[PDB]
């Protein structure tokens, strides 16, 4: 089926952000504002609240999990963010603004439960940032750990969901400059218990086209990685642990051109065997694989 | 008459029963017969049998649809190693029998 | 111009430019396609997993997994 929702944005929507039980959503505009929607019984969604953020242009919104309360996190152009939180109850207030970021800020994206309250944003200038809240019921006081230089300018960020205590922690970031040269652009950095600080792991190397979307796939019991790359294609990899930086086994399982476009965002299921894709066209497509470890289309939504 | 000696025997080849056209009944039939004989090990093998071979997981004809039973770890492996510790005993009774069964 | 993300209940969410869809390029349109894991609260809520010994808790099993659809489970909680 296809529903319809007259958001009332001022300008276009850049992203929506479902919650973590699957009764909310957060969308954000370049008009400066966020709004939330709250579904009922009769299945119609409600905007329950409307306020401006910043003083420019707002690129992501993401949610937060619900045992640290109802937290909300919102990169903007202004070359800062905020944490948002509405225990005060029934609007938004802040509670902080992180400042030290000199470019425009692209992308705010949390961390899984096992390592706290933990947020990494990304800037234009190729600096990545990793920040931390020491006692998680004093949302005032956030402090700034590790700073990453990528030399390239970052487009998208994304953690690893796994859950396993034999997987250490990882962030892939992606480039989108579209100079002439051919260099990769997507890199991946991971964190050593010994050394605490995050060093690179490998690079994509046949990788040159800009890279506009990133994101992994949840774990729930595999033993190995699976990522997702928007580009003028869609390129799905694979990442296999091997017996410093650990070493994988690079593989491309997947490159598709059905859209016959540029494909701007993917996204994954909950379980992670279905992949969504979205192009210039205007259209969705969802992929699956079946046990000859090949992917077939399984639906096209406009 | 060195008969206890050998791993075939006359009243099993007796009362052995095989019909294409219904599998549970030769199966169950067949594990009744073991169990009246004497050998307890035919008895489990012909019950995993009855399980394992129901028309209910009648394979599809597209790769799309499920995962054939075939790769299920109960499938395949169970046959190999069934096959596999019979063939040390050189019984070759027990190996006719399963591996029509299955065909 | 776009943006997309999965739901719980196998939702989708999908905004789009209206060209992709003084100037007719300032506005967006949002839309919801209602796309199931029921067979998992479902089984959920319906599992024998102690208080009975193995043969009973077995069978209750392989009925609750029958009753759905779902034979390869069936078969497998037999075999055990």
């Known amino acids: ?302 | 008459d060195i008969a206890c000696l050998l791993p075939v025997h006359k009243s099993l080849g007796e009362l052995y029963i095989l019909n294409v056209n219904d599998i549970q009944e030769t199966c169950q039939k067949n594990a009744a017969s073991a169990l009246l004989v004497g050998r307890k090990d035919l008895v489990q093998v012909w019950s995993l049998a009855t399980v394992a071979t129901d028309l209910c997981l009648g394979p599809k004809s597209d790769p799309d649809l499920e995962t054939p039973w075939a790769r299920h770890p109960f499938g395949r492996q169970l046959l190999e190693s069934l096959l596999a510790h019979y063939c040390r005993l050189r019984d070759v009774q027990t190996l006719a029998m399963l591996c029509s069964v299955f065909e | 111009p776009e943006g997309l993300c999965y739901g719980l209940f196998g939702d989708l969410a999908f905004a789009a430019k209206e060209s992709l869809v003084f100037a007719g390029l300032a506005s967006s349109a949002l839309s919801v396609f209602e796309t199931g894991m029921r067979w998992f609260v479902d089984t959920a809520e319906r599992y024998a997993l102690a208080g009975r010994p193995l043969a009973e808790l077995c069978d209750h099993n392989a009925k609750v997994a029958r009753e759905l659809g779902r034979n390869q489970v069936a078969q497998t909680w037999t075999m055990l």
Not at chain 1, 108 to 118: R, S
Not at chain 1, 144 to 170: D, F, G, T, V, Y
């Open chain 1, 1 to 302: 089926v296809a529903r319809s929702i007259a958001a009332d944005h001022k300008d276009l929507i850049h992203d929506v952000s479902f919650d973590f039980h699957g009764r909310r959503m957060a969308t954000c505009s370049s008009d400066q504002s966020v709004k939330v929607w709250d579904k009922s019984e009769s299945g119609d969604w409600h905007c329950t609240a409307s306020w401006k953020t910043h003083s420019g242009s707002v690129w992501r919104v993401t949610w937060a999990h619900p045992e640290f309360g109802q937290v909300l996190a919102s990169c903007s152009f202004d070359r800062t963010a905020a944490v948002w939180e509405e225990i005060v109850g029934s609007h938004w207030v802040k509670r902080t603004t992180l400042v030290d970021s000199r470019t425009s800020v692209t992308d705010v994206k949390f961390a899984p439960k096992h390592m706290g309250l933990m947020l990494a944003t990304c800037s234009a200038d190729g600096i990545v940032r990793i920040y931390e809240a020491p006692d998680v019921m004093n949302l005032s006081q956030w402090s700034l750990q590790h700073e990453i230089s990528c030399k390239l300018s970052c487009s998208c960020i994304s953690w690893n969901p796994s859950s396993s205590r034999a997987h250490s922690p990882m962030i892939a970031v992606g480039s989108d400059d579209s100079s002439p040269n051919a260099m990769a652009k997507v890199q991946i950095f991971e964190y050593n218990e010994n050394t605490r600080k995050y060093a690179k792991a490998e690079t994509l190397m046949t990788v040159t086209d800009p890279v506009h979307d990133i994101a992994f796939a949840p774990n729930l019991g595999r033993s190995f990685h699976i990522l997702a790359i928007a580009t003028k294609d869609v390129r799905i990899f694979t990442l296999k642990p091997v017996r410093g930086p650990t070493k994988f086994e690079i593989h491309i399982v997947a490159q598709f051109d059905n859209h016959n476009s540029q494909v701007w965002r993917v996204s994954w299921n909950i379980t992670g065997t279905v992949l969504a894709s979205s192009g210039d066209d205007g259209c969705v497509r969802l992929w699956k694989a079946n046990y000859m470890d090949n992917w077939k289309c399984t639906g096209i939504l406009k």
